[PDB]
Design a protein around this ligand. Structure first.
Ligand SMILES: COc1ccccc1N1CCN(CC#N)CC1
Ligand SMILES: [Zn+2]
Ligand SMILES: [Zn+2]
Ligand SMILES: [Zn+2]
Length: 459
């Protein structure tokens, strides 16, 4: 039950306008053969160019929408479009490049995939809405064979050079001319009615059709993400560490404790309404307050409506005390809220482009997140950076410039000189805070929140 059997049937109806007369009865084995590749009855870690939905989902970071359009098949020029927004024209002799032979076009394809993918994935998965020219163009830029390692490192080989006769990963591929052992999935096999645009546009108003190859490539990946991450959701699937995942997650826990601890001290709310993850734990276990939890899974599609979360009749009175929405995305937060909200527009290795302005945030698990909307925050203000500690001034166990900051809220700074302990802790917390913000989290708070109110929590 692991890999896609090459003896699985492939539905050819999508193929029959580029490839008239194609047999209705078709396996992966016969299709790969028709595409001009030979798998040589090879048991060497590459059983099929094509993969299961499940396998594609585990390799979402590798997804590159790919589409080819007839420009006038060997007679005529082809437009190659990638979900990176690139269009290359290959002659057989939004970025839009003039007509060039395959021997140069293939170099550009390797450079482009290597730069997109080297910090994302060990592979490429070409996401297709297959009509035929895309599959019959692969022979011109793809080589297959046994699984190999990079010539300069231990990573699996993703590229081949005809010049040097060697194999490279995405990091070591400069001057390489062939994509090696790519994977691919035809979204049209999943059983849809009507064309790509009609199916995409059911779910997404953000990706237009300019009637160019890259636009279909983008719509194809978008539809695929919608199907595997919006309508369907699987939070069991783990994803490898590729960047600052652990630091960001640690940072998110340190900021959450800091901000909620401070709001309770500053405004002394008698009740806190903790709305979101049903696994959620008290972030300030020592606080006096009545802590009431409300279960909401991460909304992958549309932001929750505050009307459905709160009304239908709890403490019932959510207007009493404060509401904590820690990555619980709602259309409009009430005035008495503390909020962490992921900004889908952030550029990072963890954040993949998503469906209808939303983004696919992949950090241990994959969370499709609805488009960031500034109007959600009209009743709140941005939470300013600050560090608060009531811990004793007391070193123990670090090289130093003395800290001066208006935003180091400690007994020692009240006293006019920040102690070494609170200086070290301030600097660690500011680093954590910067990490979290740079990762794309944004923090919002009730308008009355004032750090001036924390100074009297020591006297
Ligand atoms: C830095 O973490 C703490 C330090 C002191 C007390 C509590 C916590 N937390 C943070 C929030 N966390 C929720 C989650 N995950 C519960 C435990
Ligand atoms: Zn390498
Ligand atoms: Zn879309
Ligand atoms: Zn101190």
């Amino acid at each position: 039950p692991t890999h896609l059997s090459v003896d699985t049937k492939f539905k050819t109806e999508g193929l029959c306008v580029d490839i008239p007369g194609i047999p209705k009865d078709m396996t992966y084995r016969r299709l790969i053969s028709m595409m001009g590749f030979k798998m040589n009855y090879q048991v060497n870690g590459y059983p099929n160019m094509f993969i299961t939905r499940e396998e594609a989902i585990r390799h979402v970071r590798a997804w590159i929408g790919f589409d080819v359009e007839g420009c006038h098949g060997t007679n005529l020029p082809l437009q190659l479009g990638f979900s990176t927004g690139v269009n290359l024209v290959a002659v057989p002799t939004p970025l839009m490049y003039k007509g060039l032979p395959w021997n140069v076009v293939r170099i550009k394809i390797v450079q482009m995939l290597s730069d997109t993918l080297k910090n994302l994935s060990d592979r490429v998965v070409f996401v297709l809405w297959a009509h035929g020219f895309e599959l019959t163009s692969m022979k011109y830029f793809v080589k297959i064979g046994p699984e190999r390692t990079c010539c300069l490192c231990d990573r699996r080989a993703t590229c081949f050079s005809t010049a040097s006769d060697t194999y490279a990963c995405w990091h070591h591929s400069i001057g390489f001319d062939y994509v090696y052992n790519p994977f691919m999935i035809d979204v049209q096999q999943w059983g849809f009615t009507g064309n790509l645009q009609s199916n995409h546009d059911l779910y997404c108003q953000v990706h237009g059709n300019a009637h160019v190859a890259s636009c279909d490539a983008i719509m194809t990946r978008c539809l695929a993400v919608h199907e595997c991450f919006v309508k369907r959701v699987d939070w069991t699937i783990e994803y490898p560490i590729i960047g600052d995942e652990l630091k960001i997650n640690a940072a998110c826990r340190k900021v959450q404790h800091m901000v909620v601890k401070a709001a309770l001290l500053a405004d002394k709310f008698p009740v806190l309404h903790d709305i979101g993850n049903p696994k959620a734990i008290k972030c300030v276990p020592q606080a006096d307050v009545e802590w009431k939890f409300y279960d909401a899974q991460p909304c992958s599609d549309k932001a929750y409506k505050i009307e459905e979360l709160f009304y239908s009749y709890h403490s019932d009175k959510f207007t009493d005390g404060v509401c904590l929405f820690w990555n619980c995305n709602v259309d409009r937060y009430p005035a008495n809220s503390i909020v962490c909200r992921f900004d889908t527009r952030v550029l990072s290795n963890l954040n993949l482009p998503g469906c209808d302005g939303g983004s696919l945030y992949v950090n241990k698990h994959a969370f499709h997140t609805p488009a960031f909307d500034k109007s959600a925050f009209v009743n709140l203000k941005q939470l300013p950076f600050f560090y608060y500690s009531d811990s004793p001034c007391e070193s123990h166990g670090i090289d130093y410039v003395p800290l001066k900051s208006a935003t180091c809220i400690t007994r020692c700074n009240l006293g006019g000189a920040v102690c070494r302990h609170h200086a070290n802790e301030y600097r660690l917390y500011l680093d954590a805070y910067n990490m979290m913000i740079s990762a794309g989290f944004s923090l919002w708070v009730y308008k009355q929140f004032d750090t001036y109110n924390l100074w009297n929590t020591f006297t």
